[PDB]
Amino acid sequence: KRYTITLLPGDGIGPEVVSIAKNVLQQAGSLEGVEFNFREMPIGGAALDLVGVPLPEETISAAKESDAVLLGAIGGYKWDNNEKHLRPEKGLLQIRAALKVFANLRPATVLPQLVDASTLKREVAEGVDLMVVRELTGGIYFGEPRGIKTNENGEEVGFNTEVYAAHEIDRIARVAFETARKRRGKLCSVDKANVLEASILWRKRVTALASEYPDVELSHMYVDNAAMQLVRDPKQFDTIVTNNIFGDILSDEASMITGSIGMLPSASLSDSGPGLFEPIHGSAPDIAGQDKANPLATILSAAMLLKYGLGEEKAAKRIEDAVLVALNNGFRTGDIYSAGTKLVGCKEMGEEVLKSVD
């Protein structure tokens, strides 16, 4: 069984960490009798320098034709002062739109070995294990109309439109339901239905889908209360589904709650077609080339690729297990270094994970 995978090294530490994840993905796959055809393509800063835009059509083609996409990082000092349309970040937005990956999955789990990195007390942080499923390509970030107008009274007025069509809510909810089935069967839908008409429609559509997934325990929660519950009792959550802006905010909160941002993977899924998998950390221009980067998030992203992309559990478990073994053996990169542990560079951490995969 051969899969085609598009690699998007990108910028800063991206290539370093994608390279390691590639090898990890290859070994874990091999053990489960799975081989891969890898092709690297330009995106972000690297695409700008090479082609002159952040996402060349050739990259979209390769991604669309492959079975899954693994992305490193995007961004850097050099391109920060570019026109918005020519910024690296614009390439991320474009690839998401091109692949139609409307569903962003960010698992926030506190690993037994890293409990102390969280600013929450141990008994609260330990065993946190939640998944935020965030609507990724619609909502207020892309809503119309939008703009800054001057109302002929000379005064400027700024506006944006939070808007969802029923079919947009249906498809993100289904993914969430299917995702809860792959976890603990508990789904919490988060909105502002006590005030916003868009949230009322959100809640109506999710509520109606419940009968199609009767095995899943559905609940509802207001976004302001969810922001409190994440701080008070994050262990209550399994899977959460929510819109683009609430998802952006609540996922970041949950990420910081886990304590180690450099350990967190992400997956962006579409209805059919290849998904896009990347660590949530940025390109970390400062430590690029210095062998300091933490490759665990990208590795764990390769594990999400196997699981949510290719439906290859086992191969995925091998990766997750090897990450644990490495941490169990006391290995830590700078961002997760703790008193008494073994500080290591990116390369060496990669090697320790590869070593466990055998």
Next chain:
Amino acid sequence: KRYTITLLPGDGIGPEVVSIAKNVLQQAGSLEGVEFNFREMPIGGAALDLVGVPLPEETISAAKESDAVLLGAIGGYKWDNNEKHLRPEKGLLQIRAALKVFANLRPATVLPQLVDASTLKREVAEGVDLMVVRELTGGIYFGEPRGIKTNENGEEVGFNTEVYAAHEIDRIARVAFETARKRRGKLCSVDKANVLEASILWRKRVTALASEYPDVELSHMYVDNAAMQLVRDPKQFDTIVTNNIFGDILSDEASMITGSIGMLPSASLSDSGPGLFEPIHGSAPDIAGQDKANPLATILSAAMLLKYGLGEEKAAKRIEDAVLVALNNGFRTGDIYSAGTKLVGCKEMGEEVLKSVD
């Protein structure tokens, strides 16, 4: 020096806690050569039973003619099944609009005696002391157009409009700058300027007002990063100003981080005119009449009334100091009780705070 104060006891524990704050307010003021004329008016459930609506015109009149308004709580089981316009909560929204209190001030402070109530580790929670200044009467919660429409396909579309005019942003920012001057002179403006035109205008207006408050240290922060920063290092914040929806979310998060919701006061201020002061907790229908309520939030709201409402700094300090003394003596109502303290009822806690004031 004589002030007129409108008391809105409201529902559930409202009357209980306002009654105690009234007396505390009276004693603290008396010590500073300040007397008050109090007048109680109906709002919420109580107004519904008595007059038929959540906010009678007479209540609006009294509130407008007074120097400040102290509100208890709104809501109860009995009225939960009412039509929207006749829910108690409608009365809150209406009175805010009537008084034009566009600025909601919510101080989130961790009291030395109550540090362990927070789910954050001690060294992170201790000394947290921030103020969320939230735009209260505009933004997406009141934005037009809004609705759920059916498009040509028979498919429903739900929408809301996040919109601010320049003058709406100016006035909430000015209050925030003024508020930071009464604290530690640090103001962080929170928006989503990297994506939303409304936040771009927000940031432009706040940025232009900086020169008019050169003494205040202004910084800007994206709402998603703020949600992380409240978890990672909430002590970094002094004053935060932000829009209605982000302010609602970030303040609730900050409140839960403090660990003790029953201790948290609030102030809603206008350009000129009486402010509205109220505890952020609800009406707690479950414990009404049982002498269990924590009156400290309403008492501390009376302290805010004195300070932010009437500019009576000294009288306000007397209240804040007495609350501390009571807690130092080990007194705790159910919601703040811990091992080794003196569990007390609402009445008795009131009595201890009064004792300290003299």
